[PDB]
């Protein structure tokens, strides 16, 4: 119905009718929703410009929209628009922000804002555990990989097959076998099934070993 909605708002529009923040919001949030993303930024760039101040969903909104599309740069920079015109994002902002982050290697920048967010009380998903820690997998960096995946495992988080996978090729890398092999079996009690990659490393390892 945002056909009918949008429709109606620009007739309100022609009336000579000033919109409610209101409005704009629920706007932002249902475009952002129905991911027509560009016409949200068209909405929001508009609602910008008549000095109406934006609520903290249409941020989370744009910054999701952003991060889904790829272009992380203008994400940040809503982000920090954001921190200084004083609002507080949600778990899901830094989510995504990480999630990209992690996707274009720029790995340090999202530990930093996962540093960040745990500073101000949020608590991050399994998603952000596995996007930093199979990120910092495939930079070489397996001990800080290890560090969070005790970590995780102590705040009772559950790792699915790609972190399973990322360590133990890893660790097989290292010619950590039996440490591997611990992980292969403990994956195994979790009932997760295993990838090719696996195997082929810890066959390789063993193969090696005897």
Same mark, same amino acid.
């Given at each position: 119905?945002?056909?009918?909605a949008?429709?109606?708002? =620009? ?6 009718i000033?919109?409610?923040v ?17 016409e949200?930024?068209?909405? $929001?760039e508009? +609602? ?12 989370? /909104? ?14 940040? !920079?809503? $982000?920090? =628009? +954001?921190? !200084? ?8 902002t830094? /989510? ?19 540093? =960040? +967010?745990?500073?101000?009380?949020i ?5 952000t ?8 997998? %495939? ?9 969070? $995946?005790?970590?995780?495992?102590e ?9 399973? /996978? ?9 010619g950590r ?6 992980? $292969? !079996?403990? +994956? &195994?009690? &979790? ?9 082929? /490393?810890?066959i390789?390892?063993?193969? %090696?070993?005897?």
């Amino acid at each position: 119905r945002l056909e009918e909605a949008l429709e109606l708002f =620009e007739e309100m529009k022609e009336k000579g009718i000033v919109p409610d923040v209101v409005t704009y919001t629920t706007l932002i949030s249902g475009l952002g929703k129905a991911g027509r993303l560009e016409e949200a930024l068209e909405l $929001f760039e508009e +609602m910008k410009e008549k000095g109406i101040v934006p609520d903290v969903v249409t941020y989370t /909104t744009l910054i999701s929209g952003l991060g889904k599309a790829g272009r992380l740069e203008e994400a940040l !920079e809503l $982000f920090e =628009e +954001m921190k !200084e015109k004083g609002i507080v994002p949600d778990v899901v902002t830094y /989510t995504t922000l990480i999630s990209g982050l992690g996707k274009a290697g720029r790995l340090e920048e999202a530990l930093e804002l996962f540093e =960040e +967010m745990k500073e101000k009380g949020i608590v991050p998903d399994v998603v952000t555990y596995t996007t930093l820690i199979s990120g910092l997998g %495939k930079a070489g960096r397996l001990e800080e990989a290890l560090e969070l $995946f005790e970590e995780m495992k102590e705040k009772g988080i559950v790792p699915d097959v790609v972190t399973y /996978t990322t360590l133990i090729s890893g660790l097989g890398k290292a010619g950590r076998l039996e440490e591997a092999l611990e992980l $292969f !079996e403990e +994956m &195994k009690e &979790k009932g997760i099934v295993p990838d090719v990659v696996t195997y082929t /490393t810890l066959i390789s390892g063993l193969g %090696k070993a005897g």
